Amino acid sequence: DSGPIICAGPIHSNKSADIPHLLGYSEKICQIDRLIHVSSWLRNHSQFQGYVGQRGGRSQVSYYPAENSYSRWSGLLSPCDADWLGMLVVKKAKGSDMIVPGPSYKGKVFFERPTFDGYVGWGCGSGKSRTESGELCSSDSGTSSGLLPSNRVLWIGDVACQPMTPIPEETFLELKSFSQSEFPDICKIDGIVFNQCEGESLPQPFDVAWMDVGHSHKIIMREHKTKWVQESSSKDFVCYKEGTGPCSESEEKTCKTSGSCRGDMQFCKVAGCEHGEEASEAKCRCSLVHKPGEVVVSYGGMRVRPKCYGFSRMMATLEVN
């Protein structure tokens, strides 16, 4: 239930091995399971060589806070998982980006958090790990092998990312105005003006529910409703081979567009299946990814389908009279 989506925890032995680009959706999901995306991020941004998630995979990733509702659902994507799928971009942190207090950053190699206008990740170089405060990377002899466990990866917030239905700019302005009405005291969130203020305090940790609706910044909400609907779309199913691994792009395409590959009850319901009469040695099987579905948020008197939805810790500034 909380285990891997399609692929068990990776067992790497060659930290210099290249990370291939896989076109198939199931192949990308398998890479996400093994934390290949986080390793690629660290290689691209942090002068790091090797892998994270050794023997544990994405299912063993550390979370802040430790109790995570959406981590139980292995099918709910995180900001890094959505980044690997082209859904968003986890930008490398700059000096202006704020590190939220509360997580245990000691020994972490990568950690990302959603900021008011995006998603920001911090990484460390080869043979280095974060200090207790997370401000600096220092030499760590336990990371010298380059094949690191999943607890070196920290994801901040209870976040689920999904395909969105774009909303007009006027709707976003209405949502933003309602959010400003709900948070009169807030002035700056992550260094971004929320309300116009004349005199503000220092940044403070700020645990808040938010939805990213594909606009300039996020819609932070205090009173809202959420409902999860299973739409049985193609992205909700992953095709594997039961021992070989994820199916190739062509195999997955044939399975999802021909109704001949076998699958679970939901896949047979939505796309059809042909059990028996084994044409191949062992056909691909497509199964529903374990998630509560797509989230629809009723906020400010309107229902939207956000790009991402979560409850996370940001840094906010309060008005000073």
Epitope: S16, A17, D18, Q47, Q49, K92, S126, G127, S144
Partner: antibody, heavy 119, light 108 residues
Framework: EVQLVESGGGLVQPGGSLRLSCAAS????????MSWVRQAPGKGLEWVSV???????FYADSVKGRFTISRDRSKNTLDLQMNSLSAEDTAVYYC?????????????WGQGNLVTVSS | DIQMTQSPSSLSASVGDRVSITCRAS??????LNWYQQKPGRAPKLLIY???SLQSGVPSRFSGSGSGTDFTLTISSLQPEDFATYYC?????????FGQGTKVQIKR
């Protein structure tokens, strides 16, 4: 097959600009750590600048603010725009590739282009 | 930030001799040390990466050892074509600091 070729070097007046360029064959440049190194005549190698495959750029202390490393995906080109040049910048410049598999060692080097800053 | 010092600034040895060049870092760089060879008027050539791994195509007489702050490049049997300047570089930090080269002259 795989190679880096420098261009754009030559004589520059002090306080001028010349914008060295480096064309790659077999290397995507945008997918690699690309560095500029320089060697003054009769001196040792000196790292000038680096750009990660993620876009992060770092510069030597003596070239901060004056030098700008950049990439351009078309033509597969890595450029170094140098401004406010002085006599201390007269050197042979190499574009190199830091390969992560080699722990970011400069496995690939260009032939080098000599820039002379004299009036 | 990181200072990279090669103790034998200039070296001279006969053909077939054993040559050792020591590099010392101001701080621990783990094993992220590389040795490059530069013939006069040519681009540097990577000899060793990871402070011990030999680059493909490099003759086996070149070896690298050490870790932390002390490293050594060894030529088991000096050849007439081994005359060049040898550089130690750290790839632990984004500064990619090069050490001052060691010139290996050849006696005869």
């Amino acid at each position: 097959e795989v190679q880096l070729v420098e261009s754009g070097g030559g004589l520059v007046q002090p306080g001028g600009s010349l914008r060295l360029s480096c064309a790659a064959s077999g290397i995507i440049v945008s997918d690699n750590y690309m560095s500029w190194v320089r060697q003054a005549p009769g001196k040792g190698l000196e790292w000038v600048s680096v750009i990660y495959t993620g876009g992060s750029t770092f510069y030597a202390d003596s070239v901060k603010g004056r030098f700008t490393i950049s990439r351009d995906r078309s033509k597969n080109t890595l450029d170094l725009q140098m401004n406010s040049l002085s006599a201390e910048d007269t050197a042979v410049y190499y574009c190199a590739r830091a390969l992560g598999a080699y722990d970011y060692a400069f496995d690939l080097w260009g032939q080098g282009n000599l820039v002379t800053v004299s009036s | 930030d990181i200072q990279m010092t090669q103790s034998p600034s200039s070296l001279s040895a006969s053909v077939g001799d054993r040559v050792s060049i020591t590099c010392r870092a101001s701080q621990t760089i783990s094993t992220y040390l590389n040795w490059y060879q530069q013939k006069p008027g040519r681009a540097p050539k990577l000899l060793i990466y990871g402070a011990s791994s030999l680059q493909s195509g490099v003759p086996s007489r070149f070896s690298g050892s050490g870790s932390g702050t002390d490293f050594t490049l060894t030529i088991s049997s000096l050849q007439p074509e081994d005359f060049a300047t040898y550089y130690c570089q750290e790839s632990d930090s984004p500064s990619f600091t090069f050490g001052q080269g060691t010139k290996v002259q050849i006696k005869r």
